[PDB]
Amino acid sequence: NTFIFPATFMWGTSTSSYQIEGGTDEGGRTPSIWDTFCQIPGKVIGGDCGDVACDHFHHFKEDVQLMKQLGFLHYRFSVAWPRIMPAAGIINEEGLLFYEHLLDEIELAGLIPMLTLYHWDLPQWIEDEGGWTQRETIQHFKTYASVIMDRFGERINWWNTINEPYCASILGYGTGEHAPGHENWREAFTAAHHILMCHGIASNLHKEKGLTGKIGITLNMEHVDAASERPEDVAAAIRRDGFINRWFAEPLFNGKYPEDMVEWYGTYLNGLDFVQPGDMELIQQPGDFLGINYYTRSIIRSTNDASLLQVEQVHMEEPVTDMGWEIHPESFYKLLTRIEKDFSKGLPILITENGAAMRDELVNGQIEDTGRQRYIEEHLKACHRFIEEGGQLKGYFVWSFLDNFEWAWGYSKRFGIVHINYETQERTPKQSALWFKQMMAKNGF
């Protein structure tokens, strides 16, 4: 078995601002909804907060150098909205200088950046006005996106508008699992609509400002399997798929929300009253590429409970990461095929995030994470088959250059190919990272 990837295949690693930066109250940064969320008992394991994190705010120059010598040519990172707009009518020059400096380091190292505008760290002052449940917030996003595009843009080759609309809306306002932590389906769906519009707002700004960099949204998507052949389990699986995949993909490519899901949500949608004339047109802008984040699949069975979808995920025990997520690379191939099928069909596809959190152990100064290594290798084999079969896959970013604040999981789960000693902040590439270095060198494995 020998796998060779396209000549121009984009290889990179990704991170997000709140998960790795630290310096939460430095350089004028004011709190994000996560700084507040992490303080609510029971919301984050161990009660962890993004305070300090990997202290990237102070070690960025070394981290990008580590990337370079690790063989990477692409780096996707996000900007912390709170550093840019710490309060209404602000515009923090000190915040813009951090990224300007980050970008100087990237360029000096010869790296190509991808800047993600929104990676879940909404400024708390905005959430105080109602957050994503308010149309007005889109105006604030305009302010943010415009500033970032004017101060940069002539230096940004890749624009990633919104990272996972699903998580920010559904988990952030519906299940209460992510910040701000509301549990109101009405707000969640309104929130999802507003965030999708922000991809449109950023897209409109991009064309108006005449920027040349590629622009695209990033959706987390998962392959969905029915637990059994029972008709209700198949219907249940259809619902999960509409819930996470179609609800966001349909508006992006087809200008509409899944009718079957629109009917199921019924009263929570309150007649789609939050949808204003032109909104759907604003949202339907695929851009230059579709960003995809993939990790696992779901096995769904039907239930007649009190939940929104009335669905239960049967958890697999064999082949799973340190987070209990099943490792099923085959599903990754099926999903990419399906995405090409409906939605993108020709449009370049970019895997902005793929990776695994395994239990690490430092032995003789090294991290023999054969598990994480195998996980990445196998999913790449899936990507290979999609390619070679015509699939328009053009790049792959391993999620987590560094172990970091893994949201509700806290620091207990490590996704990095590079190990972080939280007691000293010392960085140490894991074996999976070394394997990745040479792999990109041969661009194949």
User: What b/e sequence results for 336-349 when a residue is b if at least 16 CB atoms lie within 10 Å of its CB, and e otherwise?
Assistant: bbbbbeebbeebbb
The number of beta carbons lying within 10 Å of the beta carbon of residue 66 is: 20
Active-site residue flag, 164: yes
Active-site residue flag, 353: yes
Residues 195, 148 contacting (CB under 8 angstroms): no
Residue 164 Cα distances to 160, 318, 353, 366, 436, angstroms: 11, 27, 11, 33, 25
Residue 241 Cα distances to 139, 163, 200, 223, angstroms: 31, 19, 23, 8
Residues 335, 223 contacting (CB under 8 angstroms): yes
Measured distance CA(53)–CA(137) in Å, rounded? 28
> Of 105, 127, 164, 222, which one is the catalytic site residue?
164
Amino acid in position 350: L
Residues 322, 413 contacting (CB under 8 angstroms): yes
> Of 21, 250, 340, 353, which one is the catalytic site residue?
353
Alpha carbon 419 to chain centroid, angstroms: 21
Active site residues: 164, 353
